[PDB]
Amino acid sequence: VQLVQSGAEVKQPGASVKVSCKASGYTFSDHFMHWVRQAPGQGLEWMGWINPKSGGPNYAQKFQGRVTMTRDRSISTAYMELRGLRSDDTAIYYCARPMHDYDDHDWYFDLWGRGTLVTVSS
Amino acid sequence: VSVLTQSPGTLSLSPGERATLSCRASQTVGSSYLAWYQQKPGQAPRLLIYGASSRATGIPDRFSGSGSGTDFTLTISRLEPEDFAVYYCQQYEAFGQGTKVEIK
Amino acid sequence: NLWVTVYYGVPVWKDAETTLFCASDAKAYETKKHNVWATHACVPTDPNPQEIHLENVTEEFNMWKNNMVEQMHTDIISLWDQSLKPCVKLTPLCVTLQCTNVTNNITDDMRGELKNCSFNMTTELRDKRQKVHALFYKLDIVPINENQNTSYRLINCNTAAITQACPKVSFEPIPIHYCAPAGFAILKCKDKKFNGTGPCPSVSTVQCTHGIKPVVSTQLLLNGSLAEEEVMIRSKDIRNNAKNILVQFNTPVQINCTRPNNNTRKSIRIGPGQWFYATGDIIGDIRQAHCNVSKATWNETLGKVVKQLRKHFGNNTIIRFANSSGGDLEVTTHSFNCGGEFFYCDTSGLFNSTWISNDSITLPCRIKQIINMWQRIGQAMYAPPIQGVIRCVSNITGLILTRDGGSTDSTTETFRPSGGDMRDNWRSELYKYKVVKIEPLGVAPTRCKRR
Amino acid sequence: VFLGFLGAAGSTMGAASMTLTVQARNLLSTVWGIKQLQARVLAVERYLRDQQLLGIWGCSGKLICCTNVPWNSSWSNRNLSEIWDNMTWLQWDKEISNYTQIIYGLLEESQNQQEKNEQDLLALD
Amino acid sequence: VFLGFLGAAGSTMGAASMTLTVQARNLLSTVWGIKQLQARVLAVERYLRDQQLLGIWGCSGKLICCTNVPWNSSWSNRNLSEIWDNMTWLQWDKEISNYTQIIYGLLEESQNQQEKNEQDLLALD
Amino acid sequence: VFLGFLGAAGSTMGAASMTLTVQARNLLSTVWGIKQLQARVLAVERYLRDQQLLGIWGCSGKLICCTNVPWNSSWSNRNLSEIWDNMTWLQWDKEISNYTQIIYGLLEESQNQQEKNEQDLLALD
Amino acid sequence: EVQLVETGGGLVQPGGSLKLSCRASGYTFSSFAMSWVRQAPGKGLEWVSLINDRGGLTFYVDSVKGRFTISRDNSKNTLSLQMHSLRDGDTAVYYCATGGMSSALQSSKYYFDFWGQGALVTV
Ligand SMILES: *[C@@H]1O[C@H](CO)[C@@H](O[C@@H]2O[C@H](CO)[C@@H](O[C@@H]3O[C@H](CO)[C@@H](O)[C@H](O[C@H]4O[C@H](CO)[C@@H](O)[C@H](O)[C@@H]4O)[C@@H]3O)[C@H](O)[C@H]2NC(C)=O)[C@H](O)[C@H]1NC(C)=O
Ligand SMILES: *[C@@H]1O[C@H](CO)[C@@H](O[C@@H]2O[C@H](CO)[C@@H](O)[C@H](O)[C@H]2NC(C)=O)[C@H](O)[C@H]1NC(C)=O
Ligand SMILES: *[C@@H]1O[C@H](CO)[C@@H](O[C@@H]2O[C@H](CO)[C@@H](O)[C@H](O)[C@H]2NC(C)=O)[C@H](O)[C@H]1NC(C)=O
Ligand SMILES: *[C@@H]1O[C@H](CO)[C@@H](O[C@@H]2O[C@H](CO)[C@@H](O)[C@H](O)[C@H]2NC(C)=O)[C@H](O)[C@H]1NC(C)=O
Ligand SMILES: *[C@@H]1O[C@H](CO)[C@@H](O[C@@H]2O[C@H](CO)[C@@H](O)[C@H](O)[C@H]2NC(C)=O)[C@H](O)[C@H]1NC(C)=O
Ligand SMILES: *[C@@H]1O[C@H](CO)[C@@H](O)[C@H](O)[C@H]1NC(C)=O
Ligand SMILES: *[C@@H]1O[C@H](CO)[C@@H](O)[C@H](O)[C@H]1NC(C)=O
Ligand SMILES: *[C@@H]1O[C@H](CO)[C@@H](O)[C@H](O)[C@H]1NC(C)=O
Ligand SMILES: *[C@@H]1O[C@H](CO)[C@@H](O)[C@H](O)[C@H]1NC(C)=O
Ligand SMILES: *[C@@H]1O[C@H](CO)[C@@H](O)[C@H](O)[C@H]1NC(C)=O
Ligand SMILES: *[C@@H]1O[C@H](CO)[C@@H](O)[C@H](O)[C@H]1NC(C)=O
Ligand SMILES: *[C@@H]1O[C@H](CO)[C@@H](O)[C@H](O)[C@H]1NC(C)=O
Ligand SMILES: *[C@@H]1O[C@H](CO)[C@@H](O)[C@H](O)[C@H]1NC(C)=O
Ligand SMILES: *[C@@H]1O[C@H](CO)[C@@H](O)[C@H](O)[C@H]1NC(C)=O
Ligand SMILES: *[C@@H]1O[C@H](CO)[C@@H](O)[C@H](O)[C@H]1NC(C)=O
Ligand SMILES: *[C@@H]1O[C@H](CO)[C@@H](O)[C@H](O)[C@H]1NC(C)=O
Ligand SMILES: *[C@@H]1O[C@H](CO)[C@@H](O)[C@H](O)[C@H]1NC(C)=O
Ligand SMILES: *[C@@H]1O[C@H](CO)[C@@H](O)[C@H](O)[C@H]1NC(C)=O
Ligand SMILES: *[C@@H]1O[C@H](CO)[C@@H](O)[C@H](O)[C@H]1NC(C)=O
């Protein structure tokens, strides 16, 4: 049970970043995959989730239009592509798998990813 | 979404005593859907409480919580040295602001 | 004073999980040589079924924890699998395809969808080979190489092998009734306003469920049951956005779907007893498949859904309908199969409305022959082409929706069509059914004593 | 056969003790064929277990069977009208569910083997 | 076991009512294995249904069982010698086939539950 | 349920005749699934055959059942203390194994059908 | 509220046949047992007959077992007593009464809680 993300990267404003999240240990199709944003010195900030079995993603209204999350089931990997980057998008981007509780309230992130810092600078 | 207010902004105690961190949900209907996450500096968050009161697998018993409706709280029984971090409350997709437990 | 008296046959039950057996019409079995969803694994149904009203009985139902839905999922997938074991497996067709555009009579929308593809193929004799041509859809073929050699491969061929559906086997959903074995009962909620959870004050016991047609679809429930009184909104948790919202219409929306192309079926021999059926040549003009819905009917039903959603999200909340954010073709489009051809309709016209608190629509549809059913990777099937023009009428009896999260402003709620898992399609018909175990042995005090 | 099945599940216990045959008659009836055969065989085994329980209590071929086991007020201290004219068998089963095995062990071995040995020793006289 | 099976099927009804155990002992016993298992399970279910019918009539463990149900001359107006000394059970079954369910419903619910309630209320005295 | 199973197999016959319910309760419960289904169906058929044998002897719903069949000293000439206080049921079964069918045929057809016909003819009086 | 009205009294000759009856109003007639109790003109009470609530358990005093017959119609709310071969000791005022026994599903009712007006039989 482990989620290895991609390495930290640096980008210019206006470009597009694509973080990834390889998954190992658990059945990748059984759980949803959520992407969460931790800006520096700020609270956690949820961005969206994606169903691995279907590919249907839900986004937050602030990220609607700019973020596209995808998955490749063969290699048990998920992706999140934040296009149209800006200054405030500097943050750590984690990939989180909610656990299988009894009430099917799939929002308890027992399994997080280590993080992938995206530093936007000019 | 559901607004979560996790007061106090900064709580200064010393080891071994009991701290009572609180989260208050506003735009909800009232249920037992909450989680408490611990995020040490430089590390990703970690799940402590999954539910209003239940405990995540592997977490010691010093971390316990309770609540219902629109008022919930985390109770760290014993402030051991490996228990100082930022604590967050989660109601579905919403997250708290964060509570700092700092040595003093 | 009082003594133990044993009673056998008491009307006591508990919640239980059993293996249900279907019931079907023998009539349709005589009309249907074979149907993917076998009437042979199942049993002929009993005319004049019995429904006894359990007066004064209030039972707890949970639409979201029901093992009838899981058994139906298992049964439908397994029936499909055994209906596809005997049919031919199209492994010899995994060859390089030299493909060129078809421009005989093409409208601007249908440009490039179909391609004329040539390839070398095996024949009945193992020592000889043939060169054969067939038309293929852009969605069923992938470029082999980035360079513009115009060489193409079938999408499945890398990861898996693609079976061919037998031409004689039919795809029309026929109703199946789920019956309980001896010592089990099916309790039916007769409350007309039930949301699938909580106590149901009006309960009846039925030998078998009503006929449920295994209709496979996304974003829209077709040929299903209808609400008796009002539009019904059913979610496991309406506040949670990770759970799909199932909508039941009280009045259906008629949808007329067509593929106007006059198709032909070309037999190609690939083995001693194995045939491959191909698109042949399209007699006449080529036009895109599409679906029509009445605009006024759609708008009135959408208003009704908006009212029911307002009952859960506030009386002055703005209910906005938008189209799919993304995903596979199945979920992003209204996927369905009628006549044996698999359609994929862009429902952006259907969900294009903002509802403030105070003529037909044409959906451009697309066709495919390589179908990956039930969200499984590695078990694709080839749908043989259907000869002639296909016209198709269905009732839209409900929706499958997902509410957008992370709303910065709280005055609006956005709902986008969804689907892909048919356990949420077959749970919209079994929502009112729970299987129970009869506990017929009871002990109660009486004043009577054994001599 | 199915007519009237469970129709006295909201009736009083006494009113529901007059339809026991309706529920007693409704207890007996490829890979799908073995799944349904397993369901049918489990129904048969379940009926046989219930009839064996009746038979080890001296209650064979009996839908109502009186015993020599006194009722304990610890099991239930309710009056006869409350139980038989003001309660259903479902509520009753909910109330006594944690006392059923005590009653079943006071019927299983004490009462029946004692009574049966005494009939043998009286048949000796 | 099989010896004498159905050997009184051409004998009079009375002569054939003295061999009932011979026919009672003969009622109980790959893809072929499941077909034969289905046959065996259906034989078991059929025996259980017959025994349940006997048990809901107060006729458990009984090959001959008398009841409190009067015979209706509408069912059959024949005299006792005609039936028992001048007819076989096959001819009898042919004659009464359209009256069997009336008799079975007069035994099922009227006679047995009435009698059983009266035994309970006499055990109260 | 399993507790005490066969625990009186080394006890005297009388001491072992007080635990019959423990052994009576333990008699009822892919290609592997049909093999186990065949085992379960054979267990059901075996229980039904034993209960049918009990029922054709007037011994239904009875773990101890007395009969009107005299014991023959040819079967066994041992005294009651030897059998019930100085022997186990296994040794007994070893001793009487070649006489079981004679006893079973003296119970099967003579005693029970005679007695049953006499009860019918006494019910006539 | 409870009222039991006896009818059918008269003057009979030794060996005659009479049919006493009792009507009831004010309660559920089908949920109570009913009894007949006689008082001779110069002596005390004596219990004659008992019938259960359903109407299929009938009990008689040793004197009148083969002669008297009790019966009840729970749809007409009527209790009846057929008395054949009336002897000289059968002269008394007969009371129809509610009680004497009960069902297993009710409490014990070994008493008579409601009586009737009375009906004199002279024979
Ligand atoms: C929702 O329900 C509607 C109404 O039931 C349903 O539409 C119907 O579908 C059937 C089956 O596709 C259509 O019948 C076909 O059309 C004609 C009419 O007879 C025939 O050409 C067809 O028979 C051919 O195909 C058979 C194999 O399926 C062969 O056995 C046969 O030899 C022929 O080659 C076939 O019967 C019917 O016309 C429509 N009816 C209407 C009013 O549209 C619809 O499919 C359902 N929708 C969904 C999504 O399930
Ligand atoms: C697809 O291309 C093929 C060539 O492989 C076309 O088939 C030929 O059509 C011509 C008429 O233009 C015939 O004279 C030839 O005999 C055909 N080829 C063979 C090998 O028989 C076919 O018409 C094309 N199809 C479409 C729909 O454009
Ligand atoms: C379906 O209706 C029931 C009954 O009205 C609702 O249950 C109520 O709501 C919550 C659960 O969401 C619980 O407190 C109780 O079970 C009910 N409360 C009452 C009666 O005060 C249920 O929420 C409804 N579900 C939907 C989706 O509308
Ligand atoms: C779906 O709606 C379209 C648009 O109204 C229909 O297209 C018309 O069809 C008629 C009848 O064949 C033609 O005469 C018209 O020229 C078409 N109009 C256009 C393309 O603008 C189409 O027939 C409908 N399809 C159905 C009901 O299957
Ligand atoms: C969805 O709705 C939008 C408007 O909300 C449609 O776009 C407009 O369509 C009208 C009528 O064709 C044009 O006059 C406008 O110029 C379009 N743009 C805008 C910004 O209003 C759009 O066509 C609809 N999409 C569908 C039916 O797929
Ligand atoms: C078919 O085979 C011929 C030779 O027989 C070859 O030249 C041609 O490229 C092949 N066509 C394909 C793979 O489309
Ligand atoms: C569609 O709805 C109409 C009106 O309720 C109904 O009569 C008809 O049977 C429905 N058709 C199908 C195919 O479900
Ligand atoms: C389709 O083609 C067939 C082939 O003969 C013809 O009979 C039929 O009329 C055509 N249909 C249409 C709608 O053009
Ligand atoms: C949804 O609608 C937008 C326009 O609002 C369109 O660009 C996009 O392709 C649509 N998405 C799908 C999955 O159909
Ligand atoms: C549907 O009604 C709503 C009322 O708010 C509004 O969007 C519009 O006028 C109607 N739309 C159509 C397409 O008829
Ligand atoms: C239901 O209860 C009412 C009154 O509570 C009663 O009259 C009626 O007979 C009952 N019906 C059933 C079927 O139990
Ligand atoms: C009733 O149960 C209690 C325990 O709750 C026990 O002590 C008592 O002996 C029992 N009474 C009888 C009469 O068995
Ligand atoms: C019976 O069941 C529960 C579960 O053990 C027990 O705790 C409770 O006291 C009992 N309930 C009632 C209503 O008597
Ligand atoms: C057959 O009938 C004859 C005379 O009708 C009789 O003697 C004989 O016993 C009968 N045999 C059987 C086996 O019924
Ligand atoms: C006999 O059957 C007839 C109908 O054929 C019915 O009217 C009559 O009441 C029955 N007799 C008895 C005594 O039940
Ligand atoms: C019994 O069976 C038939 C079929 O219903 C009926 O019509 C006939 O009158 C009866 N036959 C005899 C011989 O009594
Ligand atoms: C075994 O035998 C001994 C003496 O022979 C006796 O005391 C004991 O009870 C027996 N135990 C069993 C379990 O039969
Ligand atoms: C006992 O068995 C013998 C044969 O061993 C037999 O001759 C004798 O008649 C039998 N005794 C009785 C009383 O049946
Ligand atoms: C019983 O069994 C054998 C086998 O037939 C027989 O020969 C022997 O005499 C008997 N044994 C005993 C110990 O009675």
Residue with tokens 């697309």: C366
Is the Cβ–Cβ distance between B15 and B103 less than 8 Å? yes
The letter for the amino acid at A54 is: S
Q: Solved by what technique? A: cryo-EM
Is the Cβ–Cβ distance between D24 and C9 less than 8 Å? yes
Distance of CA D49 to the CA centre of its chain: 11
- State phi, psi for G37 to the nearest 5 degrees: -130, 130
Cα distances from F101 to residues D41, F80, F96, F107, G12, in angstroms, run 31, 22, 10, 10, 70
Q: Angle at which helices D31-55 and E31-55 pack, to 10 degrees?
A: 30
Is the minimum CB–CB distance between D26 and chain G shorter than 8 Å?
no
- CA proximity to C334, closest of C430, C408, C398, C261: C398
- Which of C240, C332, C419 is the closest to A105 by Cβ? C240
- CA proximity to C184, closest of B88, D6, A17, D76: D6
3-state DSSP helix/strand/coil % of chain A, to nearest 5 = 0, 45, 50
Distance of CA F23 to the CA centre of its chain: 12
CA torsion angle E111 E117 E122 E125 (round to 10): -160
Q: If DSSP codes are grouped into helix, strand and coil, which group holds residue D67?
A: strand
* Residues from chain D contacting residue F24 (CB–CB below 8 Å): 52, 56
DSSP one-letter string for F45-102:
HHHHHHHHHHHTTT-TT-SS---S-PPPTTT----HHHHHHS--HHHHHHHHTTTHHH
Find the ligand nearest to C366 CA: 9
Two structure tokens written together for C336:
């369905």
Q: If DSSP codes are grouped into helix, strand and coil, which group holds residue B56?
A: coil
Quote the CA–CA distance of B4 and A115 in Å, as a whole number.
24
- Count CB atoms within 10 A of the CB of residue F51: 22
Is the Cβ–Cβ distance between C277 and C203 less than 8 Å? no
Quote the CA–CA distance of C236 and A104 in Å, as a whole number.
9
Q: If DSSP codes are grouped into helix, strand and coil, which group holds residue C93?
A: coil
Is the Cβ–Cβ distance between C239 and B92 less than 8 Å? yes
Residue with tokens 């893809």: E31
Quote the CA–CA distance of D14 and E113 in Å, as a whole number.
13
Q: If DSSP codes are grouped into helix, strand and coil, which group holds residue C147?
A: coil
Q: Residue C230 gets which letter from DSSP?
A: S
Beta carbons within 8 Å of D46's beta carbon, 6+ residues apart: C183, D27
Is the Cβ–Cβ distance between A116 and A19 less than 8 Å? yes
- Count CB atoms within 10 A of the CB of residue A110: 20
Is the Cβ–Cβ distance between C128 and C346 less than 8 Å? no
Quote the CA–CA distance of C63 and C428 in Å, as a whole number.
9
Quote the CA–CA distance of E47 and G45 in Å, as a whole number.
58
Two structure tokens written together for G19:
């049919």
Cα distances from C421 to residues C246, C336, C425, in angstroms, run 12, 13, 7
Vertex E80 angle, CA E76 and E84, to 5°:
100
Two structure tokens written together for G59:
């009990």
Quote the CA–CA distance of D57 and C4 in Å, as a whole number.
11
Find the ligand nearest to C64 CA: 3
Is the Cβ–Cβ distance between C62 and C217 less than 8 Å? no
Chains C and A touch (3+ CB pairs under 8 A): yes
Q: Which residues pair with C402 in a beta bridge?
A: C416
Quote the CA–CA distance of E58 and C116 in Å, as a whole number.
80
Find the ligand nearest to D11 CA: 11
Q: Write a three-state SS string for A45-81.
A: EEEEEECCCCCCEEEEHHHCCCEEEEEECCCCEEEEE
Quote the CA–CA distance of G110 and C253 in Å, as a whole number.
71
Is the Cβ–Cβ distance between C399 and C247 less than 8 Å? yes
Q: Residue C270 gets which letter from DSSP?
A: -
Kind of pairing, strands B63-68 and B71-76?
A: antiparallel
Kind of pairing, strands B10-13 and B99-103?
A: parallel
Quote the CA–CA distance of F80 and F86 in Å, as a whole number.
9
Of all protein residues, the one whose alpha carbon is nearest to atom 11 of ligand 13 is D95
Is the Cβ–Cβ distance between C8 and D24 less than 8 Å? yes
Two structure tokens written together for D96:
């006594």
Sign of CA dihedral C354, C355, C359, C365: positive
- Which of E45, E116, E120 is the closest to D29 by Cβ? E45
* Residues from chain F contacting residue E47 (CB–CB below 8 Å): 48
- Count CB atoms within 10 A of the CB of residue E78: 14
Length of chain C as a residue count: 451
Does D108 contact ligand 13 (Cβ within 6 A)?
no
If phi over 0 gives left and psi between -120 and 50 gives alpha, with beta otherwise, what is residue C310?
alpha
- CA proximity to G96, closest of G11, G20, G18, G40: G20
Of all protein residues, the one whose alpha carbon is nearest to atom 45 of ligand 1 is C338
Q: Where are the beta strands (DSSP E) in C102-175?
A: 114-122, 129-137, 141-143, 151-154, 163-164
Quote the CA–CA distance of C86 and G56 in Å, as a whole number.
68
If phi over 0 gives left and psi between -120 and 50 gives alpha, with beta otherwise, what is residue D58?
left
- CA proximity to F9, closest of F83, F29, F20: F20
Q: How many CB pairs under 8 A join C and G?
A: 7
Is the Cβ–Cβ distance between C200 and C49 less than 8 Å? no
Is the Cβ–Cβ distance between C175 and C429 less than 8 Å? no
Find the ligand nearest to F74 CA: 18
Two structure tokens written together for G95:
């009371």
Beta carbons within 8 Å of E120's beta carbon, 6+ residues apart: C5, C446, C448, D64, D66, G104
- State phi, psi for C304 to the nearest 5 degrees: -65, -45
Q: Which residues pair with C60 in a beta bridge?
A: C199
Q: Angle at which helices E31-55 and F31-55 pack, to 10 degrees?
A: 30
Vertex C305 angle, CA C303 and C311, to 5°:
105
C282, C283, C390: residue to mutate for ligand 8 pocket, most atoms within 8 A of CB: C283
Distance F64 CA to ligand 19 centre (A): 26
Report chain F's C-alpha Rg in angstroms. 18
- CA proximity to C370, closest of C384, C390, C386: C384
Interface test with G, best of E111, E121, E122 (most G CBs within 10 A): E121
Quote the CA–CA distance of A111 and A22 in Å, as a whole number.
13
Two structure tokens written together for A26:
């658990």
Two structure tokens written together for F100:
């079981």
Is the Cβ–Cβ distance between G34 and G96 less than 8 Å? yes
Is the Cβ–Cβ distance between C323 and C206 less than 8 Å? no
Q: If DSSP codes are grouped into helix, strand and coil, which group holds residue C403?
A: strand
Where b means 16+ CB within 10 Å and e means fewer, A19-33 reads bbbbbeebebeebbb
- Count CB atoms within 10 A of the CB of residue E2: 8
Is the Cβ–Cβ distance between C9 and E56 less than 8 Å? no
Please classify residue G114 by burial: count the beta carbons closer than 10 Å to its beta carbon, then call 0-12 exposed, 13-18 middle and 19+ buried: middle
Q: If DSSP codes are grouped into helix, strand and coil, which group holds residue C33?
A: coil
Of all protein residues, the one whose alpha carbon is nearest to atom 1 of ligand 16 is E98
Strand order in the sheet with G3-7: G3-7, G18-25, G78-83, G68-73
Is the Cβ–Cβ distance between G100 and G72 less than 8 Å? no
Is the Cβ–Cβ distance between C55 and D10 less than 8 Å? yes
Is the Cβ–Cβ distance between B94 and B26 less than 8 Å? no
DSSP H helices, D9-30, are 13-16, 20-24
Helices and strands of chain E, counted as H and E runs: 7, 0
Q: Where are the beta strands (DSSP E) in G52-114?
A: 58-60, 68-73, 78-83, 92-99, 112-114
Find the ligand nearest to C3 CA: 12
- Which of A43, A101, A113 is the closest to B44 by Cβ? A113
- State phi, psi for F53 to the nearest 5 degrees: -60, -40
Kind of pairing, strands C232-234 and C245-263?
A: antiparallel
Two structure tokens written together for B103:
């040595």
Is the Cβ–Cβ distance between F67 and F111 less than 8 Å? yes
Is the minimum CB–CB distance between G104 and chain C shorter than 8 Å?
yes
Distance C264 CA to ligand 8 centre (A): 10
- CA proximity to D119, closest of C391, F61, C107, C386: F61
First to last CA, chain F: 47
H/E element, C398? strand C388-403
Quote the CA–CA distance of C449 and D68 in Å, as a whole number.
6
* Residues from chain C contacting residue A32 (CB–CB below 8 Å): 242
Q: Which residues pair with C396 in a beta bridge?
A: C222, C253
Q: If DSSP codes are grouped into helix, strand and coil, which group holds residue E59?
A: coil
The letter for the amino acid at C365 is: C
* Residues from chain B contacting residue A108 (CB–CB below 8 Å): 35, 47, 50-51, 56
Distance C198 CA to ligand 3 centre (A): 7
Sign of CA dihedral A6, C418, C427, C383: negative
Is the Cβ–Cβ distance between C447 and C1 less than 8 Å? yes
From F121, which residue of chain E is nearest by alpha-carbon distance?
E66
Quote the CA–CA distance of C283 and D46 in Å, as a whole number.
64
Quote the CA–CA distance of C424 and C354 in Å, as a whole number.
26
Q: If DSSP codes are grouped into helix, strand and coil, which group holds residue C349?
A: coil
Task: Count CA atoms within 13 Å of residue A41 on its CB side.
Answer: 1
Beta carbons within 8 Å of C330's beta carbon, 6+ residues apart: A54, C218, C344, C372, C375, C419, C420
Interface test with F, best of D52, D53, D107, D124 (most F CBs within 10 A): D52
Where b means 16+ CB within 10 Å and e means fewer, F91-105 reads ebeeeeeeeeeeeee
Quote the CA–CA distance of C206 and C185 in Å, as a whole number.
7
Interface test with D, best of F41, F67, F68 (most D CBs within 10 A): F41
Chains F and D touch (3+ CB pairs under 8 A): yes
Is the Cβ–Cβ distance between C10 and C437 less than 8 Å? no
- Enumerate the domain spans of chain E: 6-122
- Cβ–Cβ below 8 Å for E61 and F54: yes
Quote the CA–CA distance of F113 and E16 in Å, as a whole number.
13
Distance of CA G38 to the CA centre of its chain: 8
Distance of CA E40 to the CA centre of its chain: 21
Beta carbons within 8 Å of D72's beta carbon, 6+ residues apart: none
Report chain B's C-alpha Rg in angstroms. 13
Quote the CA–CA distance of D38 and D29 in Å, as a whole number.
13
Q: Which residues pair with D58 in a beta bridge?
A: none
- Cβ–Cβ below 8 Å for E123 and C5: no
Vertex D86 angle, CA D14 and C57, to 5°:
85
Q: Where are the beta strands (DSSP E) in E4-82?
A: none
Is the Cβ–Cβ distance between C381 and C162 less than 8 Å? yes
* Residues from chain A contacting residue C326 (CB–CB below 8 Å): 55-57, 68-70
Please classify residue C233 by burial: count the beta carbons closer than 10 Å to its beta carbon, then call 0-12 exposed, 13-18 middle and 19+ buried: buried
Please classify residue B57 by burial: count the beta carbons closer than 10 Å to its beta carbon, then call 0-12 exposed, 13-18 middle and 19+ buried: exposed
Of all protein residues, the one whose alpha carbon is nearest to atom 1 of ligand 18 is F72
Where b means 16+ CB within 10 Å and e means fewer, G32-63 reads bbbbbbbeeeeeeeeebbbbbbbbebebbeee
Distance F74 CA to ligand 18 centre (A): 7
The letter for the amino acid at A107 is: W
Q: How many CB pairs under 8 A join D and G?
A: 14
Is the minimum CB–CB distance between A115 and chain B shorter than 8 Å?
yes
Distance of CA C338 to the CA centre of its chain: 11
Quote the CA–CA distance of E117 and C33 in Å, as a whole number.
55
Beta carbons within 8 Å of B40's beta carbon, 6+ residues apart: B46, B84, B85, B86
If phi over 0 gives left and psi between -120 and 50 gives alpha, with beta otherwise, what is residue D124?
alpha
Cα distances from F78 to residues C108, D120, F67, in angstroms, run 107, 21, 19
Is the Cβ–Cβ distance between G73 and G84 less than 8 Å? no
Quote the CA–CA distance of A46 and A25 in Å, as a whole number.
24
- Cβ–Cβ below 8 Å for A46 and C159: no
Is the Cβ–Cβ distance between C174 and C24 less than 8 Å? yes
The letter for the amino acid at C73 is: H
- Count CB atoms within 10 A of the CB of residue C59: 20
Is the Cβ–Cβ distance between C135 and C147 less than 8 Å? no
Two structure tokens written together for C146:
């980035």
Distance F95 CA to ligand 18 centre (A): 17
The resolution, in angstroms to one decimal, equals 2.8
Q: Which residues pair with C233 in a beta bridge?
A: C247
Cis-peptide, bond into residue B8, ω within 30° of zero: yes
- CA proximity to C214, closest of C223, C205, C206: C223
Quote the CA–CA distance of C426 and C418 in Å, as a whole number.
15
**Domains observed in chain G:** 3-123 (2.60.40.10)
Beta carbons within 8 Å of G104's beta carbon, 6+ residues apart: C5, C446, C447, C448, E120, E121, E123, E124
- Cβ–Cβ below 8 Å for E60 and D61: yes
**Stretch 39-78 of chain E: residues touching chain F, C-beta under 8 Å:** 40-41, 44, 47-48, 60-64, 66
- Cβ–Cβ below 8 Å for B92 and C407: no
- Cβ–Cβ below 8 Å for G101 and E122: no
